[PDB]
Design a protein around this ligand. Structure first.
Ligand code: CL
Ligand code: CL
Ligand code: CL
Ligand code: CL
Ligand code: OH
Ligand code: OH
Ligand code: ZN
Ligand code: ZN
Ligand code: ZN
Ligand code: ZN
Lengths: 233, 233
């Protein structure tokens, strides 16, 4: 009802939606395969500065993201984390770096991003290489649930607000079929999701990579969709 | 350019685009899988009445389509053709029929729609049962190129304006991967596309089922995508 949709967001623009105190999602609309969809990332306040989760796909959009943050929040983004290596999550990293933002990702993501020719976050996030690994990063906890949408995908939990951002490892309810699974691990995706359920059973707000937020139901929904795809179809 | 996009068209709204004298396309935005795509159909003037090609997917959208035609063109829609049996092309037939529009489709389409529990056009178009078959239908020529997006898909040519509408058998250039192919004949799709090229080499405007129109280049693009999907990209 209040959450921004593609109808409110022209391609190239960015909206912010405050989930809780000091926690926002940033929403940007992207063109793909001739379709337009809303892409989610996360913003989390940390003291008097901001932690960014994922870009807005590309230089232009990521510049628009920084401008929307300054307009609505007005605190500096000092650090940024990319949840996996695909261009829509690391695209814009160069703009962030040039603006003075410290960019972060796992060695797995940086590795894969380089092979793909994508932009590469400067700093490496250690202690996330094994499935089930969790590390604290300021106002959030980074978690590697195992392979799913990609072998390197991370999810982000904000303990102060009980917010779980799943990136493309989590589907919105409106998504009834599998998205881009070229780099996915269909055999492991359900198991990885269950690691998330087990580790964050208290989560109250779940943010999918694309589309509308919900509750923990989005996990079982995603599993249902992934399994249906596996059985083809 | 100037062809309308999803941004200019809110969900549930329909816009018309004049391609040539007495030849429009109608564009409606649909939400599917959490993404929004712009869906094309055709409108061809025949004397002092109009020929409609395909609905706007759904009773509501099709009602809006009839309202937009009435507002912009102000000539009665007396006949309608659905190009294949899927709900986005026959969904709205009941609204059209209630509005006094004579609805048409091949016997193949009507049977497949009935099996699927979709709305069924009243009239049966004979002479389109075998690949390469063409028949005249007022100001257009209907053509069955053979199985492609579906076993029953038709394409429509307007000889007056050299406009070719291919429905979901033709992809826009922005579409790099196969869309819904559950009911498609991937094996025959390239061969059917070549029948269209052979039959309408003089086509100047080519309208894909979804998205931006182009030239005959759209044909080879579609084949390339289909063959890649066959070999699994
Ligand atoms: Cl630093
Ligand atoms: Cl730095
Ligand atoms: Cl009738
Ligand atoms: Cl009649
Ligand atoms: O992605
Ligand atoms: O379709
Ligand atoms: Zn991805
Ligand atoms: Zn640094
Ligand atoms: Zn179809
Ligand atoms: Zn009749």
């Amino acid at each position: 009802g209040e959450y921004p949709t593609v109808s409110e967001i022209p391609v190239g623009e960015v909206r912010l939606y405050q989930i809780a105190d000091g926690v926002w999602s940033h929403i940007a609309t992207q063109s793909f395969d001739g379709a337009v969809y809303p892409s989610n990332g996360l913003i989390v306040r940390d003291g008097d500065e901001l932690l960014l989760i994922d870009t807005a796909w590309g230089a232009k959009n990521t510049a628009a993201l920084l401008a929307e943050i300054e307009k609505q929040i007005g605190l500096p983004v000092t650090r940024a984390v990319s949840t996996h290596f695909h261009d829509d999550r690391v695209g814009g990293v160069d703009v962030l770096r040039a603006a003075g933002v410290a960019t972060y990702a796992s060695p797995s993501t940086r590795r894969l991003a380089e092979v793909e020719g994508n932009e590469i976050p400067t700093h490496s996030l250690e202690g996330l290489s094994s499935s089930g690994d969790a590390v604290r990063f300021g106002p959030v906890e980074l978690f590697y649930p195992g392979a799913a949408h990609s072998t390197d995908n991370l999810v982000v939990y904000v303990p102060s607000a009980s917010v779980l951002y799943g990136g493309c490892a989590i589907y919105e309810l409106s998504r009834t079929s599998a998205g881009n699974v070229a780099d996915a691990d269909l055999a492991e995706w359900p198991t990885s999701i269950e690691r998330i359920q087990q580790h964050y059973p208290e989560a109250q707000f779940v943010i999918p990579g694309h589309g509308l937020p919900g509750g923990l139901d989005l996990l079982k929904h995603t599993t249902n969709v992934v399994k249906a795809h596996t059985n083809r179809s």
